[PDB]
Amino acid sequence: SQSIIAYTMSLGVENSVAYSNNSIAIPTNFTISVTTEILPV
Amino acid sequence: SMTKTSVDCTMYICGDSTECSNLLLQYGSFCTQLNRALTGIAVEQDKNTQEVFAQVKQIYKTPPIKDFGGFNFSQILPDPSKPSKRSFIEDLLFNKVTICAQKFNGLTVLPPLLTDEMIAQYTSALLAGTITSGWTFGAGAALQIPFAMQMAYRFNGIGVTQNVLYENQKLIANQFNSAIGKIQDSLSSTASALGKLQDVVNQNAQALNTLVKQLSSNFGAISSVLNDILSRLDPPEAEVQIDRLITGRLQSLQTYVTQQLIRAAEIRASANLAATKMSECVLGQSKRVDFCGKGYHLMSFPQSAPHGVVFLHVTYV
Amino acid sequence: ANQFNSAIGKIQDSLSSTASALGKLQDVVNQNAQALNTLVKQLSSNFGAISSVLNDILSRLDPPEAEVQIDRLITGRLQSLQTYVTQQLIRAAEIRASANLAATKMSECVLGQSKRVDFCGKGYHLMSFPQSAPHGVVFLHVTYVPAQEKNFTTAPAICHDGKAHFPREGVFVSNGTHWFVTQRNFYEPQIITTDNTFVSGNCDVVIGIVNNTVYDPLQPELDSFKEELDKYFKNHTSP
Amino acid sequence: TDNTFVSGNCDVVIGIVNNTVYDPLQPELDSFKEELDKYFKNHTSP
């Protein structure tokens, strides 16, 4: 029941920013993230 | 980016000829390395376009209410009445900078993975996140901030105390809105304004025009046309004349691919500069001296353009 | 400490589980393998000569014809090295560029802390730890990423006595009944004081300004001395 | 005294100039001398 399908690519998940002239979002908690980046020398 | 070109050397050198094709097999990988080189260049064109424009994994959208503290972004933001989400300044960018023979001579041009609307959609997301949320959506979760409160931090970062914005906000908004009117007028008035991108379009046209014209070049043979050699000479003399065309057409492909690899390094370098300005001028505020235009950097507004990116840098002078 | 220790456990698992994880260095070995394989394979190519083997020319042809066939192999093999070395100078420019980026990330990410946006991983750069790899360098970038956002009501400035108070560090935020200053990279509320803010101009020029009472740490410190001052005079009226 | 900080004497700085540095606490203590002195003046009358 599997087959190769063709589709228009999604650019990312859609997200409208809740912008207002009297509201601000502030992070109440945080992530300390370790991210690998590899460069040839 | 620059025009994605795939050239099948099998048809370029030995266009519709089995006799010639059997002679090109005597040179082997020369045909292979030429196809691999142009395929690698084409693959890197989507890498360059994504490294510069695809810096956000969410499709950010602008609010229905445009209360940005008096700052008028209507010339840089999308226009829903249009079939594509281009701004007034982006329509000037694509209108100021502007084929059959190429495809007929074995030259194939590949479409970008991000279309002219998809590149403009990432530009719209970069504009929406920047104006509604500042740098925070690039470095983590998108944090909403009123744009006039965003500008105060911008001024603090360049050594201007936050009171200078709010005590002069009407003058600062009038200076930006008047300067954006001058961006529209300047870009609509000068034909050579996008000369940085017109050099990419002109380089691709001159390179592909040299690559097509070189098929008519004799290279010392009795004719440039393989069918005129085969129509006049037998299997002994025709191969001697065709080898002149194989060597010369082969040199014309190596000349084209060498110029495309060297120009691909220029486009890689320019896309890397655009990637670092997209992060540091658009997705942030740069304390780097003269990196996001002349003056003390407040912020930059990205706009898409033919084969490139246009930065509208806002600086305190 | 648990966040770093758990994230390093995830770096170990990711690097041990995915074969393509080091693809940026595997492309160096793969490019050199394809380049050197094409460079040797082309010695078997005829280039238009009667044979790819130089001894097959010398075994069959005299001093007149053998020189013509040998020049076919010299020209083609010479084009093989010119194509190879051209591709090696073009690739060496990519290795120089990537080594210069790694050198600037070593100095700014390992030898220091980088304020450059997205130069030392995604997030606010804390530190980077170098690890060596075949033909390259691996940077383990540690970044602070804001994760749990909460929406608050906010104001550009506070009005106290007809004077505009602006934040020193932070933003003005409301819990719904009270106002506090907090830093834009972590929600920690602080009392709106005369030390947390600075004064500039009247309360009419700031669009969206709000009214509240700004705490003066010196006010109870001098009011407690006002009652001592009054007891000092009362004590000296008695003798 | 809040806009500036102290470091060393007035002889070590080449080109230093004389001025009066305002102390925000000085008028706050001068008002305590004026209250004290007016309480004493009134207390001589009864």
Numbering used by the authors:
A (entry chain C): 689 to 729
B (entry chain B): 730 to 827, 850 to 1068
C (entry chain C): 924 to 1162
D (entry chain B): 1117 to 1162
Publication text:
It forms homotrimers protruding from the virus surface and, once engaged with the host-cell receptor–human ACE2, undergoes a substantial structural rearrangement to fuse the viral membrane with the host-cell membrane. A large number of SARS-CoV-2 neutralizing monoclonal antibodies bind S protein, especially its receptor-binding domain (RBD), providing a basis for vaccine development.
We also resolved two cryo-EM maps of the Beta S trimer, including a one RBD-up open state (termed Beta S-open) and a transition state (termed Beta S-transition) at 3.5- and 3.6-Å resolution, respectively. The proportions of the Beta S-open and S-transition are ~53.1% and 46.9%, respectively. For the transition state, the RBD-1 appears less “up” (the RBD-1 tilting angle is about 49.5°), and the RBD-1/2 appear more dynamic than that in S-open with density for large parts of RBM missing. In the meanwhile, the other portion of the S transition is in similar conformation to S-open. Compared to the WT S (94% particles in the tightly closed state and only 6% in the open state)8 or the G614 S (35.6% open, 26.0% transition, and 38.5% closed), the Kappa and Beta variants display a great population distribution shift towards the open state (~50% open-prone transition state and ~50% open state, without detecting tightly closed state).
